[PDB]
């Protein structure tokens, strides 16, 4: 790999080169960049409607908002800057935008500060068991926003209540808004409270003078469901600008490869993305974001040839890149390729060392 002459000796496996023309390697333009395109990521679902709802539903009657048929931008979980506690399990929040799901839900409720811990997978408690249980396989997130100045009232806000008793614990993501009287002892309650009989619902003591552990916290649990069915809602995909007249890779919505993009007169129908030649190979594509048709000319390549007289004559040698123009570069273009290391002359002689297209080489004074 010192000089092209030495590539000839290692090719022929000989320390002496005779007159002629010899092939040594294959030129190939490697890619410098890469293009990633995808259709527009607008039409976002309004997650702020739940995370910043004007009013929240009670705990025993927690509200759920279904998210489907849109682009779920999960950056609001952190970029909102409107929360006190933010945690996720299984999947990081920065990766949710790349993961597609079948169904997504926003389970909102207002619970005490000490009860924020109960919103966790596999955790037990007054809120986890009787109000809102999470499964062990929960791979979502939870955000608690201190609403001491909003969801509080002196003497206790009676609009926010929860379930303190129930004959049987609830299932994951199960809601129970019944008023059945709970039984503690062996006596029948007769549908009314009494000896060893309590009401199942209880109001919260949310007041503006409450502590950090007792104040109201607007909690929202973003539940995910990855089922066998096809995905219906996914996050925004990463993309960049377009690079033309340069050897680059391709990662389109439905096309991949490597080549060079150029403007052309071709046309793709509204229901068409990428074209093909007779050999099932792609040679055209339409941008998923812009309205343009771009032909895909692949990166240049070609066999490398050396033109040398005999080793006993001289070590001055030319080089020929078959089937490519002068890109990397005593230079002369031919119809066979770019020839470097040779001087063209207007005269004509007998052909000593052929090249192609009627052109020939020789070593003369």
């Amino acid at each position: 790999a010192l000089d092209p002459l030495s590539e000839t000796k290692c090719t022929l496996k000989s320390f002496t080169v005779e007159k002629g023309i010899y092939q040594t390697s294959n030129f190939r333009v490697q890619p410098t960049e890469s293009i990633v395109r995808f259709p527009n990521i607008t039409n976002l679902c309004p997650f702020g409607e739940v995370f910043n709802a004007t009013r929240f539903a009670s705990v025993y009657a927690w509200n759920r908002k279904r998210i489907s048929n849109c682009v779920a931008d999960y950056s609001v979980l952190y970029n909102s800057a409107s929360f006190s506690t933010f945690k996720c399990y299984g999947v990081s929040p920065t990766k949710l935008n790349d993961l597609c799901f079948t169904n997504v839900y926003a389970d909102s409720f207002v619970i005490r500060g000490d009860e924020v811990r109960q919103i966790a997978p596999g955790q037990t408690g007054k809120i986890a068991d009787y109000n809102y249980k999470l499964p062990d396989d929960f791979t979502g997130c939870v955000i608690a926003w201190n609403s001491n100045n909003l969801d509080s009232k002196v003497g206790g806000n009676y609009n926010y209540r929860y379930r303190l008793f129930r004959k049987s614990n609830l299932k994951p993501f199960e809601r129970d808004i019944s008023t059945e009287i709970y039984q503690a002892g062996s006596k029948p309650c007769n549908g009314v409270e009494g000896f060893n009989c309590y009401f199942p619902l209880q109001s919260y003591g949310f007041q503006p003078t409450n502590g950090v552990g007792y104040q109201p916290y607007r909690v929202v649990v973003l539940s995910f469901e990855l089922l066998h069915a096809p995905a219906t809602v996914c996050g925004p995909k990463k993309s960049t600008n377009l690079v033309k007249n340069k050897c680059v890779n391709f990662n389109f919505n439905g096309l991949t490869g490597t080549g060079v993009l150029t403007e052309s007169n071709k046309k793709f129908l509204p229901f068409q993305q990428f074209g093909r030649d007779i050999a099932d190979t792609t040679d055209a594509v339409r941008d998923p974001q812009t309205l343009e048709i771009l032909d895909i000319t692949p990166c240049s390549f070609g066999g490398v040839s050396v033109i040398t007289p005999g080793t006993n004559t001289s070590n001055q040698v030319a080089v020929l890149y078959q089937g490519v123009n002068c890109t990397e570069v005593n230079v002369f273009q031919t119809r066979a390729g770019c020839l470097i290391g040779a001087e063209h002359v207007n005269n004509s002689y007998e052909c000593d060392i052929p090249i192609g297209a009627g052109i020939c080489a020789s070593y003369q004074t």
Partner: peptide
Amino acid sequence: VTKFNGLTVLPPLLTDEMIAQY
């Protein structure tokens, strides 16, 4: 009388104009 997978077509030594001169 009438591609990029490593396939390449080399040209001939003599062009059609050079054949006609012979």
